[PDB]
Symmetry: C2
Subunit: 209 residues, 2 copies
């Protein structure tokens, strides 16, 4: 039914910076740290990025991606909605809440506008009931529905979000293009640690960072 | 070694639109079709892309990537420079042959800037001796040098270039973002046919389109 669809390309397409889901929300803490003169060069940007990756980005976004992926495999919509409720309640202020929700809704809507892509009955049920979808959670359900391997879905999502964070630093600090590339390289070892950790964590760790 | 380096992440990084090598040059052969009202919608854009992908892009760019990858595994530098000579000599107009060179030169330099990345003896020797590098040929040597699988290298390069082409159509026709996503989805089957075809071609087909 998705005979004409190739997951190897589809994972690249939905993680492409150009995938049309409205405006982005990672540049949030950054602009504050720039005004505070806490992030003003390559070295300080890197430490900022590592700190962020291993706090809220791991314990909220990455972990939630995994939780909704695993629950989707068990057709457990209830747990998915519960994860989304926990995240919504731990998110402030209302502007970030609103934006994250917009991003979530846009991700789902963009998939759905591709009429020739069949997401399956479970995904479409999720799409109809979700109140506070996020990019990471709806992605988790997306990957589970199409049978994309978890470690691969994570790796691709992790790289894409981080790339967005770094290009944010390059523009806002600013940094040099090569500085951004050096940063992305040095983050590869943290990336795999992050992925390892994500697999060890369970729902009790959700939003604790 | 490259102990801290993960090819899984590096392949995403070098194919990111953010990789600072400058703008791709597929945009050159589309402006006329638009002006002349030949590419006007999603449908005619798809056809133009399919035609483009399976002509000059296949017989020059994708094939050249494959040929320098293969020669790199044999550590046959003479054959690599031979491929680049053929492309340089077959490329007009002058302006496009200069743009392509820059793009190729920028790819190599960007890699070299990342000092914590060890490209290895052969790639360094290629870097010292190349005269008319291109993005595709330099990328081929890069992929083989790091032990990245050929089909995977092709898939990532192909998707990235095609995303760029589609974005050009979206911006130029212009088209809606949704239409661009439908186009990329529709091209997944063609992508696989393009890759299997690439593996069947050899030097005797180089630049014959």
């Amino acid at each position: 039914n998705n005979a004409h669809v190739d997951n190897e390309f589809l994972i690249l397409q939905v993680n492409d910076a150009v995938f049309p889901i409205g405006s982005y929300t990672h540049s949030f803490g950054l602009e504050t740290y720039i005004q505070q003169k806490k992030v003003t060069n390559k070295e300080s940007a890197l430490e900022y990025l590592k700190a962020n990756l291993s706090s809220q980005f791991l314990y909220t976004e990455m972990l939630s991606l995994k939780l909704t992926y695993e629950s989707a495999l068990q057709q457990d919509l209830k747990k998915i909605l519960g994860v989304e409720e926990v995240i919504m309640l731990s998110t402030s202020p209302m502007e970030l809440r609103l934006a994250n929700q917009k991003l979530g809704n846009r991700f789902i809507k963009t998939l759905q506008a591709m009429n020739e892509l069949d997401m399956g009955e479970f995904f479409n049920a999720y799409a109809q009931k979700t109140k506070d979808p996020t990019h990471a959670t709806s992605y988790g359900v997306f990957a589970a529905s199409l049978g994309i391997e978890l470690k691969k879905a994570l790796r691709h999502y992790l790289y894409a979000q981080t790339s967005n964070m770094v290009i944010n630093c390059v523009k806002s600090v600013p940094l040099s293009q090569n500085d951004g590339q050096k940063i992305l390289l040095s983050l590869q070892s943290p990336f795999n640690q992050l992925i390892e950790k994500t697999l060890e964590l369970d729902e009790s760790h959700l939003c604790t960072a």
